[PDB]
Amino acid sequence: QVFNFSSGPAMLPAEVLKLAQQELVAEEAEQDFRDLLNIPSNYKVLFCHGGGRGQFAGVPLNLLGDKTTADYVDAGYWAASAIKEAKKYCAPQIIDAKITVDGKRAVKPMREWQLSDNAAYLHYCPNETIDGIAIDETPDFGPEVVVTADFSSTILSAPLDVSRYGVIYAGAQKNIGPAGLTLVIVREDLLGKAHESCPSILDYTVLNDNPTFAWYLSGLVFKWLKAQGGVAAMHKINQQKAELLYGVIDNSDFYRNDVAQANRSRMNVPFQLADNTLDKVFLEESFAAGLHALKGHRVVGGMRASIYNAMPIEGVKALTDFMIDFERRHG
Amino acid sequence: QVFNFSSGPAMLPAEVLKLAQQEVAEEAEQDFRDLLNIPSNYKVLFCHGGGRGQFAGVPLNLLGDKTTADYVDAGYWAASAIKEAKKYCAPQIIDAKITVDGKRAVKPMREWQLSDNAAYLHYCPNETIDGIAIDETPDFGPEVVVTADFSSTILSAPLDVSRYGVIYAGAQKNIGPAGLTLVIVREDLLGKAHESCPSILDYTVLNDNPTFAWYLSGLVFKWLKAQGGVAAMHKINQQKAELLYGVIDNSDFYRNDVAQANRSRMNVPFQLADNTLDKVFLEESFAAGLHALKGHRVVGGMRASIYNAMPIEGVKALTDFMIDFERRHG
Ligand SMILES: [Ca+2]
Ligand SMILES: [Ca+2]
């Protein structure tokens, strides 16, 4: 059978597809999303068209207010993209959180992040798909820090204390499934200060007032999640999926992963082959074994396996069985 | 069977769904280019969102070093575009609304007072709520950059794309799939987006570097080609329009106040002579399988959208219903 380990567009749960097949709703989707994550009533939830990239502009356009600076954490590619886009609207104060721990790539803990007092908000990316770096720490800054975070590749994989954030956004294409949809969770008191020239389609206050198909699909994905035991159940399953894959990579001298354990992503697992010359055959033999889209991003090279909610444990097992046999044959 | 006359979100063609029922992306653009005969000096962008985004996207990409643009107001969507443009420039408003033979009309293009300092000219060729269409082919000088919101009529007729600077259309109306917006832009207009234009709205960035609505559109474009293309579609829409307007005009019971020359072939608003019967018309038509005919809250009355996907059998069921309703309530 075929398993697709692509980071985006990512796979759709086996059942959602089937349900989609046999049934061929509206407002329920949002309620289900609020229920799944236990979103407090003081948070507005917006469903807008477009990918997550839009919010690289959306956040500064809605939250700078009359301020001209904002704190941005750089710990990888998407965080750096957010920063490049923010320069159009403010002078971001860049917090370089990249460090080496035990010879591997890691990220400084939040208490060491140097925030500036004039910052309009703080922005960070809890999961970098290309780098395989995750920041799982729950934010706990004072009530004067407005925390904004890009949860595109990890929303719905673990419980989340939404109350600790100002804005949480996520393109639906990675961990939810349907492409073309973006979710924005926004603390209500932050509404009302969008730049006068912010396009209406990006204005949180305007959208807060006044339905695709990706909406329907997501609706089914939320029901499926609830039926699986929700975000707590998904967290358990993802924890085992990650352990199985990282376990195989670490017990082999043939496969390598250079990210500190505390910052290892549970959704995107990049790895290299010790003998780099075998990359071609690895991609050819894996592809010819039902294991799709493993080539790492051009920027980094190597291999990358995305194991989102939709990816079952059987899919990860097939990948690991293949890696072991391949090392057995080329090692 | 059920026929849905909603202006947006709109109906999908029967075959596209059956084809879709079982079970790629790059052909979609080539098929769109071919349907409309888009010249090679135009870029075609497929992006997310509805057409509303372009109310901002056009001025953000085309103002350049100018601070004004000419905007034609002959309806609701044209007025909304103007309202959004005030965020980026001082629009020079051309009031094209006139009365002809006692009915709502639009001033011919040669009477549009253009400004020399304008970065472009914007107009809406088909107003869904007002049922007003401006079918005239633009033929302004080469110093006029014409931009237009074709959301509600794209693909319903042949179009001389070479006469425009930018043509944009949300797909939710005449193509079907919500979530997709198509922008056709003459390549020489690229490269002057405002430095603060968000990247998702920047034509130059989108051009430099896929959804499901993308796949559906591909099916719709293939379906259109199999029907004989835009020329065929135009012919069928003409007949659908003639039937609906014909029945409305031949009755004293139903009224439409739009001048013949500006009658939309896609959005047909109408009132009942005795408007107290509005509730009953909606309940009985809904019960007869004729859905979403309620005219927009503002204008009131009734409105039937008859896009490419709406077959003539649907228009005929609507008219047979209108005729029987007059028999029973007239
Ligand atoms: Ca290893
Ligand atoms: Ca009449």
SS3 readout for A231-253? HHHHHHHHHHHHHHHHHHHHHCC
Residue B7, annotated as binding a ligand: yes
Residues of A in contact with B196 (CB under 8 A): 88-89, 197
Residues of A in contact with B88 (CB under 8 A): 197
Residues of B in contact with A213 (CB under 8 A): 177-179, 212-213
Inter-axis angle of helices B229-249 and B312-329, nearest 10: 0
User: B interface mutation test: which of A78, A206, A212 has the most B CBs within 10 A?
Assistant: A212
CA distance A47 to chain B (A): 11
Beta bridge partners of B46: B182
Inter-axis angle of helices B213-227 and B26-36, nearest 10: 40
CA–CA separation, B29 and A265 (whole Å): 37
- DSSP-derived secondary structure letter, A295: B
Tokens of A12: 């759709």
Instruction: Name the fold adopted by B1-13+228-330.
Output: Aspartate Aminotransferase, domain 1 (3.90.1150)
DSSP string over B242-267: HHHHHHHHT-SSEE--B-GGGB-SSE
Residue B172, annotated as binding a ligand: yes
CB contact set of A233 (below 8 Å; sequence gap of 6+): none
What is the CATH code for A1-13+229-331? Answer: 3.90.1150.10
C-alpha dist (Å) from residue B67 to A243, B59, B63, B90, B195: 58, 9, 7, 6, 15
Backbone angles phi, psi at A231, to 5 degrees: -65, -25
Domain boundaries, given as residue ranges, for chain A: 1-13+229-331, 14-228
Inter-axis angle of helices A230-251 and A28-37, nearest 10: 60
For tokens 């797909």, the residue is B171
Q: How many CB atoms lie within 10 A of CB A226?
A: 14
CA distance B52 to chain A (A): 7
Q: Which CATH entry fits the domain spanning B14-227: 3.50.50.60, 3.20.20.220, 3.40.640.10, 3.80.30.20?
A: 3.40.640.10
Question: Is B213 in contact with A213 (Cβ distance < 8 A)?
Answer: yes
CA–CA separation, A208 and A131 (whole Å): 34
CA–CA separation, B309 and B288 (whole Å): 20
Q: Which residues of A81-97 are buried (b: 16+ CB within 10 A; e: fewer)?
A: ebbebbebbbebeebeb
Identify the architecture of domain A14-228 in CATH: 3-Layer(aba) Sandwich (3.40)
CB contact set of B107 (below 8 Å; sequence gap of 6+): B96, B97, B98
Q: Provide the Cα torsion B230, B231, B236, B240; round to 10°.
A: 80
| B173 assigned to active site | yes
Residue B189: strand, helix, or coil: helix
Which among A245, A291, A234, A243 is positioned nearest to A270, based on CA atoms? Answer: A245
Residue among B84, B196, B211 whose CB faces A88 most closely: B196
Question: Is B213 in contact with A211 (Cβ distance < 8 A)?
Answer: no
In the Cβ-directed half-sphere of B42, how many Cα atoms lie within 13 Å?
Answer: 24
Among chain A residues, CA nearest to B48 = A50
* Cβ–Cβ under 8 Å, residues B92 and B120: no
Beta bridge partners of B69: B91
Question: Is A213 in contact with B177 (Cβ distance < 8 A)?
Answer: yes
Inter-axis angle of helices B312-329 and B278-287, nearest 10: 130
